[PDB]
Ligand binder design. Structure first.
Ligand SMILES: [Cl-]
Ligand SMILES: [Cl-]
Ligand code: NA
Ligand code: NA
Length: 129
């Protein structure tokens, strides 16, 4: 599914991401825009052979099992294909584990490089939430 901006913001609020670990909703919408262009089906291979999956581009090295990333972990205890669903629950629940692991949203390269230190509230402007 390709979400609209405000549709995704509402879904992420319904799932408890607004101010989760102190990150306002606009941070999560901004990260999703630049990680996946709001597309739940997005996949991208990494140089080390791992793959990123879904709206928040969650990595198979640590977080999910895709059957082809040797020596990797599965800390969210899910198949990576679950992260491509039109239902974002699995992606959100795994992202909550990632953002809580000590490095906050710096785990998402695109967030650090394109959202951190910008007016992230712009990403939810106009939306009925
Ligand atoms: Cl959803
Ligand atoms: Cl933090
Ligand atoms: Na915000
Ligand atoms: Na894995």
């Amino acid at each position: 599914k390709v979400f609209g901006r405000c549709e995704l913001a509402a879904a992420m609020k319904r799932h408890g991401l607004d101010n989760y670990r102190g990150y306002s909703l606009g941070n999560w919408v901004c990260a999703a825009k630049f990680e996946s262009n709001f597309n739940t089906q997005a996949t991208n291979r990494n140089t080390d052979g791992s793959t990123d999956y879904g709206i928040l581009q969650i990595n198979s090295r640590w977080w999910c099992n895709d059957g082809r990333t040797p020596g990797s972990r599965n800390l969210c205890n899910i198949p990576c294909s679950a992260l491509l669903s039109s239902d974002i629950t699995a992606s959100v629940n795994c992202a909550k584990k990632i953002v809580s692991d000590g490095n906050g949203m710096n785990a998402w390269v695109a967030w650090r490089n394109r959202c951190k230190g910008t007016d992230v509230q712009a990403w939810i402007r106009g939306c009925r939430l």
